[PDB]
Paper text:
To this end, we decided to investigate the structure and mechanisms of the PROTAC MZ1, our potent and fast VHL-recruiting Bromodomain and Extra-Terminal Domain (BET) degrader, which exhibits preferential degradation of Brd4 over other BET proteins. Of note, MZ1 forms the most cooperative, stable, and long-lived ternary complex with Brd4BD2, even over its close homolog Brd3BD2, explaining its preferential Brd4 degradation selectivity. To gain a deeper understanding of degraders’ mechanism of action, we determined structures of multi-subunit catalytic complexes, composed of the full CRL2VHL, an E2 conjugating enzyme loaded with ubiquitin, and Brd4BD2 as the “neo-substrate,” all assembled together by MZ1 as a representative PROTAC degrader. By combining cryo-EM structures, cross-linking trapping strategies, and biochemical identification of ubiquitinated lysines in vitro and in cell, we determine the structure and mechanism of the entire PROTAC-induced Cullin 2 RING ligase VHL catalytic machinery, and how it operates to catalyze ubiquitination on its highly specific neo-substrate—the second bromodomain of Brd4—that is recruited to VHL by the PROTAC MZ1.
In this ubiquitination structural mimetic, wild-type Brd4BD2 was first N-terminally fused to the C terminus of ubiquitin (G76S and K48C), mimicking an acceptor ubiquitin (Brd4BD2-UbA). A UBE2R1(C93K, S138C, C191S, C223S) mutant was generated, as S138 has a role in positioning the nucleophilic substrate near the active C93 site; we therefore mutated Ser138 to Cys to allow for maleimide reactivity and mutated C191S and C223S to avoid bismaleimidoethane (BMOE) cross-reactivity. The UBE2R1(C93K, S138C, C191S, C223S) mutant was loaded irreversibly with wild-type ubiquitin via a stable isopeptide bond at the C93K residue (UBE2R1-UbD). Within the (NEDD8)-CRL2VHL-MZ1-Brd4BD2-UbA-BMOE-UBE2R1-UbD complex, MZ1 and the cross-linked substrate-E2 conjugate serve as a stable bridge between the N- and C-terminal regions of CRL2VHL, with the goal of encircling the full complex into a closed “ring-like” structure. (B) The ~3.7-Å-resolution cryo-EM reconstruction of closed cross-linked (NEDD8)-CRL2VHL-MZ1-Brd4BD2-Ub(G76S, K48C)-UBE2R1(C93K, S138C, C191S, C223S)-Ub. Pleasingly, we observed enough volume corresponding to the UBE2R1-UbD conjugate that allowed us to model it bound to Rbx1 (red, yellow, and green, respectively, bottom left). Crucially, we observe that this hydrophobic patch surface is fully buried in contact with UBE2R1 also in our cryo-EM structure, evidencing the UBE2R1~Ub bound in a closed, precatalytic state (bottom middle). While Brd4BD2 and UBE2R1 are not in direct contact, nor do they show any protein-protein interactions, we observed that K456, which we had found as preferentially ubiquitinated, points directly toward the E2~Ub electrophilic site (bottom right).
Residue numbers in the entry:
A (entry chain N): 0 to 71
B (entry chain D): 17 to 51, 53, 58 to 112
C (entry chain B): 61 to 208
D (entry chain A): 351 to 404, 413 to 456
E (entry chain C): 1 to 80, 85 to 104
F (entry chain E): 1 to 118, 128 to 380, 385 to 497, 503 to 625, 635 to 658
G (entry chain R): 27 to 59, 67 to 104
H (entry chain U): 1 to 75
Amino acid sequence: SMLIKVKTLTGKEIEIDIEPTDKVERIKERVEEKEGIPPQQQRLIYSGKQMNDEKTAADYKILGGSVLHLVL
Amino acid sequence: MYVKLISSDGHEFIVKREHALTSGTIKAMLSGPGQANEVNFREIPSHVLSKVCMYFTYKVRYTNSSTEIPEFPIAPEIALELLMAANFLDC
Amino acid sequence: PVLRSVNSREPSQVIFCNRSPRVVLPVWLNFDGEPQPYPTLPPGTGRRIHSYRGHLWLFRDAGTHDGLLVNQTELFVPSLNVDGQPIFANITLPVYTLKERCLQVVRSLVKPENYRRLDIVRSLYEDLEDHPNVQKDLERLTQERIAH
Amino acid sequence: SEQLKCCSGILKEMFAKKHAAYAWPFYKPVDVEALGLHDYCDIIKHPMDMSTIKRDAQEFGADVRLMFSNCYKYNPPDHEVVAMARKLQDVFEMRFAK
Amino acid sequence: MDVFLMIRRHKTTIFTDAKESSTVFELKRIVEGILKRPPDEQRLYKDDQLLDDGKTLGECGFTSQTARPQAPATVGLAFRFEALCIEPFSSPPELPDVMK
Amino acid sequence: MSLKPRVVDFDETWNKLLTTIKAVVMLEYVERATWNDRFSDIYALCVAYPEPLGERLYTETKIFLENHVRHLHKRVLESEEQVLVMYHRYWEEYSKGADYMDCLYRYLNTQFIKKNKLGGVDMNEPLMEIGELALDMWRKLMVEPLQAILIRMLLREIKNDRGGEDPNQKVIHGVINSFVHVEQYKKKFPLKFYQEIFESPFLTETGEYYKQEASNLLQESNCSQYMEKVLGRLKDEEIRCRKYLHPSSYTKVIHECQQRMVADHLQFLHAECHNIIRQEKKNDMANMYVLLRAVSTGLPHMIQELQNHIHDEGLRATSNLTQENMPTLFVESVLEVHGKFVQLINTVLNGDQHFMSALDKALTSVVNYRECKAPELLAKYCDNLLKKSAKGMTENEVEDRLTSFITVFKYIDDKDVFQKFYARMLAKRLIHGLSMSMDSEEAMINKLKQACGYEFTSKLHRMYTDMSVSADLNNKFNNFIKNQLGISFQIYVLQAGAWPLTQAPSSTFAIPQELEKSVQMFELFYSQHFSGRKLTWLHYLCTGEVKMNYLGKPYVAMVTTYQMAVLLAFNNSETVSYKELQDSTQMNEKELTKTIKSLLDVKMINHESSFSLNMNFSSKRTKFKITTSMQ
Amino acid sequence: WNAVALWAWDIVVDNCAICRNHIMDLCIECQANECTVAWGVCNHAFHFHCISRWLKTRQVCPLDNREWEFQ
Amino acid sequence: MQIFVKTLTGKTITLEVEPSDTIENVKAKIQDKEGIPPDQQRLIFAGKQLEDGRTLSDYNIQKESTLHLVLRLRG
Amino acid sequence: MARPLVPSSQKALLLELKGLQEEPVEGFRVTLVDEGDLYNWEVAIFGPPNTYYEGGYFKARLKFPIDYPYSPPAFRFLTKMWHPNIYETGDVCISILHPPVDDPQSGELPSERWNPTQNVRTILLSVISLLNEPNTFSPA
Ligand SMILES: Cc1ncsc1-c1ccc(CNC(=O)[C@@H]2C[C@@H](O)CN2C(=O)[C@@H](NC(=O)COCCOCCOCCNC(=O)C[C@@H]2N=C(c3ccc(Cl)cc3)c3c(sc(C)c3C)-n3c(C)nnc32)C(C)(C)C)cc1
Ligand SMILES: [Zn+2]
Ligand SMILES: [Zn+2]
Ligand SMILES: [Zn+2]
């Protein structure tokens, strides 16, 4: 239900909608569903910590409008 | 619950089977068919079987715990016979 | 060797107190893992020692090298200290199998070579002759650590 | 008063965890029985320590110098204890001069 | 404070344990578990004098010193009634000539 | 006692032990005294004098076991068609034995095999304690020879079981678990004999048979029945595996059935998923979900189809609406779609987060639909809820409506346009007093803040704080005046960066005498009580009391400053022209025209144009206020 | 009559660099309970409570490299 | 054109410059707008230092972009 | 029940973190290593495009002193880096992180030296710039 944008290196702010109890795998797959980057070549960076594929988004204290870092 | 060992002269030694099961050969003699209580034999004299039983009791009571764990004295005369019997009983 | 004293250079203080009637000579493992002897402690006699944090030390019997249990484990690892108080290690005996204990009694009561003078079979003569080498214990401990 | 306060501050800085990597050996007086040094007492006729130290700042400076020199004379020149003592004494001298 | 006992009749012998404060009735219950003749049929002695149920083993002379685990004390046996009789074990071997 | 050293006639002693162990291994009753006597003789043999016969005892026991298991193999062959049952009988026989006859030789183990195990240059077979020897030789001389035949007959038995028959579960499980019992006592691997010699053949054949059965079901019946019968088959397979196999292979067999019934036909399942979901067939939807969950590549396609259906349904329900009540109809359609499909996912799709995300994406696309129209309508709807026009609704109902509005707005992608509409709506509501509940407005602002940070709400939060500050400053000015103008004080001061109606005037407007005195007093109070950025006088919004004594009854109205000046211009003459009023007021032409129109509408005045005061003007109450119609 | 006239304009926020607070709002340290604003030679605005600490730590302005002095 | 400039004071400002103005001109405008001499000013864009002797077109910075200003740095 | 008194350094660190989160800075992300430790923050460094470090992910550890913002925090890269101005232990030699102590022999101006007006974002930008433009005058 939340709204987040995955900022790429170029600068394109990809807006995506996730749930309060979403998963890192689902968040990464959302980028592929709208950006095309395969889930096996994505490394989300949030608050200087490498996003894990198992921890839920709630453990990372993700709030609406938070800019996410994606590096290919 | 109590196994009745037997020595040469005819002595009958009764002891808790939970203690007596610390010796592998007695565990074997009890795990077999028939029931395997009473466990008779061919060498051991009563004076050696008594010391082995005392070792069984000591091995539960005054060990495997936080304590000084003293040495249970072995008379130098019985040393050979008790060594051979401990070899046989695998205790 | 896998078991070796850590050359951290971090000071550490300890005390090795003997609770078993035997005389215990604390053994020190060097940086490469080779055992290093230490002065003996009389039965019931304990004192302080100097060793850096991460050192690996074992115990032995004064005459027969019979194994002694230090702090309920094969090896004792001294960490750093607080306020200069040396660590407290207690040496106590293991649970001897009857064959091993009677073997130890025979060895104590008869000198290391006089074993073949005794009136039993030569198989147990061979058992008598085996004074436990620290190397076998170290190898067994390394294997057990690898397995566990 | 000012000299005594400065000496107390220097001692506190030395005892702080900042230099504890090298000041650890001198935290308390040397324990002869624990160290197993039979001739340590004969070698050093006046033992001293940071804890023991804790008229003027000259007395504190002399005590610190004597404490350092005892270890310097007792231990070999290439001793890790000697190196740590020298490292601590560098900061001590810097604080005394400042 | 534990007390260990080596109960005996004729040349037969038994191994059990108890508490110093335990009553002779409790020890008779242990013998009931052993024999397994119940306590009323039993008849106990140390060394030769008959015990009394109400008496504690500490009162009877058993103590952690006298009845140590390596040297368990001896208790007499008889049944309801018959007399007491105890005989020793077999004599140990001879020290071999080399250790003499 | 124990067992003494002895000179033993090995031939006769071994022959006696030989017949006795024969009797015990074949389950024949043997007395415990005799068995312990055999134990006796074995100690003697292993301590024999002058030298131990333990080696020959071991060799003779090895030969005895080889003879015995070869006997049993010849017996199985002779059994012809009863191999399963007679093998199970022999296995019970020989396993109980090599448990007993291990303890009995345990002494020999310790003395000889443990003590001589290794060494020699030749790669000879290592010595094996009697238990390992017995089981390994059973393997080597009954299982490895028959492995093909036993596999064949056990596979056929389980196939009968699949075809509805019920062969002997105990026998079949025992025969299938002996292959794992023969693993015991070797540390190399726990299960490899069973895995590579039964599991692999059985998995191969079960896969083949269920692929054929999937073909049968597909060719026979329709898609719904096919899913139902596939699920039934999988359940029955789990039961069968539990009954028969080793627990380590349950997963492998069920995986084989899923792969050979679902994954290797996923194209048909995907093709008919369209029809099933688009037809909202709940039962087949649930079956499709359960089956495709077992395949990694399955659920994404069904997620896509549900996403597409929700998108289309929302679009249809929101575009087919009438134009009479566009905001309310829009929001209600969005919420009913949301609720319907959330309930559907929770009930039939197990509340899967992936399908919840699909629902969220579809409703996001719908709520950002356009030819933006949707944010416009949403802003209008929240505005209408908060206005006084929502007559009859209680505070709790308003709160519930606000919660629903927030739930719908969470998916609003056009936040910029949404805020652009909402700022003007809220500012108009606040300034003119049209807001139904300031507390409700504060609650909505708090919800928006929690949703999108303080940055998003900055404008509305500042507008609300400014309304509150204007009220507080009016109270403070009244207090200061009382602590020391012919009329009260009610004027507005706003920040141009948030309020969208901040069209400050610039003409040399001449405020009435009372208004000028009040403004002077307020400015004098402000100069000492506060400082900061400057603002132009928003006379177009400020309202104040103007008394119409010319009427037959007393009447005082709190009216706009421009309106007040226009009304006071009538004090000169009953009839006033546009040019004279403009000259007197010094106001802008558009503002003067708007004020004249508002006065005519209120009936206060009557119509190069000229107007005259309305002597018939009346009000509901003697004291009232005029609304700010200068937006 | 009500009329309207507001804000009596008189000239930025001059956000302090040390504390990051507002000029009107008291310094960060003073918030926990007469915090005057001190201006430097470069005209930078800095709270007295934080400006004194910065000067005591080092006699250099936080923004500019010139000396800190009032008017 | 117009660009976004962030100062060490946290406040945000914008500058109206063309693709012909030099880095020195941009620095002078920033100094005039903020109150920092050009000597202790450093513009960083896309994690790269902005050389004084260049032009905006050299780094390909269009309108609406952001420029980061920091203090002097060295080794 | 009075709430515990928030320290000035802790409040400054919280404000800096909030500002960084509200205004994302390209090339890095700042987050606390432990929620209960406001003086230990993890920062991720990403190589700027068109540079030798493009596509790289180097982690850094920032430790703020109890006297913040009076004293600059300790910055060191967690990932092994080989640069003239970066030590083997990960320490970064930057004039911004140096204490505001007047050192005429150092050759670094007090204005370029660490000042209270500096921020974590400014320090990160300076480090990123130095990564592409290392200073060889005083290599570390
Ligand atoms: C009597 C006994 N009974 C049963 S055990 C035992 C016994 C126990 C401990 C000791 C002494 N401790 C050791 O030998 C320890 C135990 C084990 O952890 C290994 N070990 C070592 O000392 C090893 N040493 C290290 O790992 C550190 O190596 C640096 C080599 O120098 C060590 C000491 O030199 C030999 C004798 N000299 C001294 O002790 C002088 C003494 N040194 C030091 C000293 C020594 C080393 C360092 Cl790095 C710094 C300071 C010293 C002090 S005060 C003080 C608290 C110390 C630690 N000191 C002062 C002041 N002046 N002199 C000293 C070793 C085998 C390499 C010598 C003696 C007997
Ligand atoms: Zn300045
Ligand atoms: Zn300040
Ligand atoms: Zn202050």
